[PDB]
Amino acid sequence: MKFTVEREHLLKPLQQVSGPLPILGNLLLQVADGTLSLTGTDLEMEMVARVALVQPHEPGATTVPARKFFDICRGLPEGAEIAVQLEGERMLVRSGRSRFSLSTLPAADFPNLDDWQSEVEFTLPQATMKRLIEATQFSMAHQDVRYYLNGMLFETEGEELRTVATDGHRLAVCSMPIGQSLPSHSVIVPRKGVIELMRMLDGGDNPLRVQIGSNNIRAHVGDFIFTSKLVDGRFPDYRRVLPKNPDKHLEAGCDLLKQAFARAAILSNEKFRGVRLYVSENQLKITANNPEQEEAEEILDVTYSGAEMEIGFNVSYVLDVLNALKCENVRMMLTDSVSSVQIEDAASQSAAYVVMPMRL
């Protein structure tokens, strides 16, 4: 196995196949039919990056320490030529008067995911999948014993793809039309897989092809192919959590709302983070207090014409939402003091967020 390649034709592929038993700490390298393939895996998911070889090359395959190899390539100067050749049990890397000899492990020992058949497929712009994931990712659970929440639901229905995330306390949903007729279907992508998928998306003109099997998901964009197992479990139904008829709409500028809440949060309970809202004609008042009896109060002009009411909620969750929206204006959809709140960009129903009420 031998190849010579420009440094910058390796770095993005290396970035993608690297991670965030010891062979899982290596990258599989393969030279075949004019192409260098690099694969990383943690047994649950895998990334394959292909790079065209325009310079003389010789076929073969090995595995090499991922972090050391990446760091060597990155440490070489911009534009450097990197010549690689297998020499016994070692991989030799040379560029200029810099030389390196890395340990290998056999390509035969690099683990594969089981083979599987694709049952649902669709293509969509990368920007669209990026918006879907970014809209909801922050509401996924981390390491909950309810293992099926440590991930994101992907739901196809009609011509729409939808993502849902919840940690069992708060919920995020995003839906976007993708212009293809789809079966009604849903799967749970593990949280790490979501993150890896997200980082594969450069926001470019390459279309994204998604293929979903009964136990796996695959995403293809240009020179990259990502494959992950699905979480084998039942996701909760997002539909029963959405408020039925939130008939009291408050609208206000996102930043003003966010800044008022961030100030109020400073004097809220450090563990439970409850803040109270008092809504009246075109006016919102936010209060917070803590066990030390310190108190915050914010009054803002907003748009509102419903009946007066008050509601409490977790200010950390509400701030998470307002930071995810990054938009001009926000809509808070209210029912009463004992019902959840749904929050949206005032100018788009594509993403919605639900936060539980708190009795304070």
Ligand X SMILES: O=C(O)[C@@H]1CCCc2c1[nH]c1ccc(Cl)cc21
Contacts with Ca ion, residue ranges (CB under 5 A): 40, 47, 99, 101, 159, 177, 205, 274, 288-289, 295, 297
* Of residues 5 and 194, the one with the C-beta less far from Cl ion: 5
Instruction: Assess 263 for contact with a copy of itself (CB under 8 A).
Output: yes
Query: Total residues contacting a copy of itself (rule CB under 8 A)?
Result: 29
Tell me: is residue 30 an annotated ligand-binding position. no
The mark string for 145-184 relative to Cl ion (x by CB under 5 A, - otherwise) is ------------------------------x---------
Tell me: is residue 137 an annotated ligand-binding position. no
DSSP class of residue 258 equals H
The mark string for 61-100 relative to a copy of itself (x by CB under 8 A, - otherwise) is -------x--xx--xxx------------x------xxxx
- With CB under 5 to 8 Å by kind, the binding choice for 170 among a copy of itself, Cl ion, ligand X, none is ligand X
Provide the CB-side half-sphere exposure for 135 (13 A, CA). Answer: 28
Residues ≥6 apart with Cβ < 8 Å to 184: 156, 157
Are residues 46 and 118 in contact, defined by beta-carbon separation less than 8 angstroms?
Answer: no
Contact residue for a copy of itself among 159, 295, 308, 328 (CB under 8 A): 295
Token pair listed for 249: 């709409």
Listed residue (92, 96, 95) closest to 62, CA to CA:
92
* Of residues 171 and 217, the one with the C-beta less far from ligand X: 171
Instruction: Assess 102 for contact with a copy of itself (CB under 8 A).
Output: yes
DSSP class of residue 230 equals P
Are residues 230 and 211 in contact, defined by beta-carbon separation less than 8 angstroms?
Answer: no
Handedness of CA 126, 130, 133, 137 (dihedral sign): positive
Listed residue (235, 224, 221, 208) closest to 154, CA to CA:
235
- With CB under 5 to 8 Å by kind, the binding choice for 9 among a copy of itself, Ca ion, ligand X, none is none
Instruction: Assess 236 for contact with ligand X (CB under 6 A).
Output: yes
Helix (H), strand (E) at residue 235:
none
Q: What span, in angstroms and rounded, lies between the C-alpha atoms of 283 and 305? A: 9
Listed residue (358, 355, 336, 335) closest to 344, CA to CA:
355
Instruction: Assess 334 for contact with ligand X (CB under 6 A).
Output: no
- With CB under 5 to 8 Å by kind, the binding choice for 263 among ligand X, a copy of itself, Ca ion, none is a copy of itself
Burial class, 237, CB count within 10 angstroms (exposed 0-12 / middle 13-18 / buried 19+): exposed
Instruction: Assess 348 for contact with Cl ion (CB under 5 A).
Output: no
Tell me: is residue 147 an annotated ligand-binding position. yes
**Site for ligand X, residues 159 to 178, rule: CB under 6 A:** 166, 168, 170-171
Binding-site residues sit at 67, 143, 147-148
Contact positions toward Cl ion, by CB under 5 A? Answer: 5, 53-55, 175
Binding-site residues for DNA sit at 67, 143, 147-148
